[PDB]
Design a protein around this ligand. Structure first.
Ligand SMILES: [Cl-]
Ligand code: NA
Length: 259
């Protein structure tokens, strides 16, 4: 299923293409909708870039304190934190938090560059057992979200399983995992997306993403009250290049799958 029917109805009403994967770690059950189709990740890919740097820091413990220059030449389209630090330096920790909590695109590019570019972030995904994730481009072009274009895409199923590994599993060391979760719980951009469809008492760590074709995404680890955690990925994209974001569709998808 009945949840399936309701998601299909939501997708039809929304006019777009909706991809949902819920992992309920209470019973290892899944709710899936278009969960093997590819969707442009847009800013949700920043979680994988931050995780790759965190993984590197397991071998180089001072890595996160390493300072990175921010130059005018680094600015791109959306740099709310980086623009405050032009001609100075930010640590890799600060850049990670900036990418995850403000969706700063300079921060993302600096994370990508540090680990060796999009192919290296992808190789990190492969090391985790995620053969679906692909990061092809840097910011800002990885957000074009052209229909049929596989660049910078993943599936809901793969992203949900990978997010589970990163936040609830053992992909990262305890310190690094805790840091990732702390950052995602501190996200400032998600209140209108998955969170808006959940009870106020639940704790969410999430990363939103938006891009071309009205692509509106959110990936979340959810701690319900007195329940085992959930992983929820909601990806949404629309047929018109200039379509507006529909965060309400993700909130509605979240409400449907957690009732
Ligand atoms: Cl249009
Ligand atoms: Na993925």
């Amino acid at each position: 299923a009945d949840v399936q029917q309701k998601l299909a109805e939501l997708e039809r009403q929304s006019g777009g293409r909706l991809g949902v994967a819920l992992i309920n770690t209470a019973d290892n059950s899944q709710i899936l909708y278009r969960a093997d189709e590819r969707f442009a990740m847009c800013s949700t890919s920043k979680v994988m870039a931050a995780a790759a740097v965190l993984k590197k820091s397991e071998s180089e413990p001072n890595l996160l304190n390493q300072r990175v220059e921010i130059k005018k030449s680094d600015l791109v389209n959306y740099n709310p934190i980086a623009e405050k630090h032009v001609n100075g330096t930010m640590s890799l920790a600060e850049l990670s938090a900036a990418a995850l909590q403000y969706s700063d695109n300079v921060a993302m590019n600096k994370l990508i560059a540090h680990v060796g570019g999009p192919a290296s972030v992808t190789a990190f995904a492969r090391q985790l057992g995620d053969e679906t994730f692909r990061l092809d481009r840097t910011e800002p072009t990885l957000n074009t979200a052209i229909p049929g274009d596989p660049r910078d895409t993943t599936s809901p199923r793969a992203m949900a399983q990978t997010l589970r590994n990163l936040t609830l599993g053992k992909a990262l060391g305890d310190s690094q995992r805790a840091q990732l979760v702390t950052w995602m719980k501190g996200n400032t951009t998600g209140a209108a997306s998955i969170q808006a469809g959940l009870p106020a008492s639940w704790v969410v760590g999430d990363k939103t993403g938006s891009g071309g074709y009205g692509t509106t995404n959110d990936i979340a680890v959810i701690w319900p009250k007195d329940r085992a955690p959930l992983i929820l990925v909601t990806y949404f994209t629309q047929p018109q290049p200039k379509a507006e974001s529909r965060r309400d569709v993700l909130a509605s998808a979240a409400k449907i799958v957690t009732d």
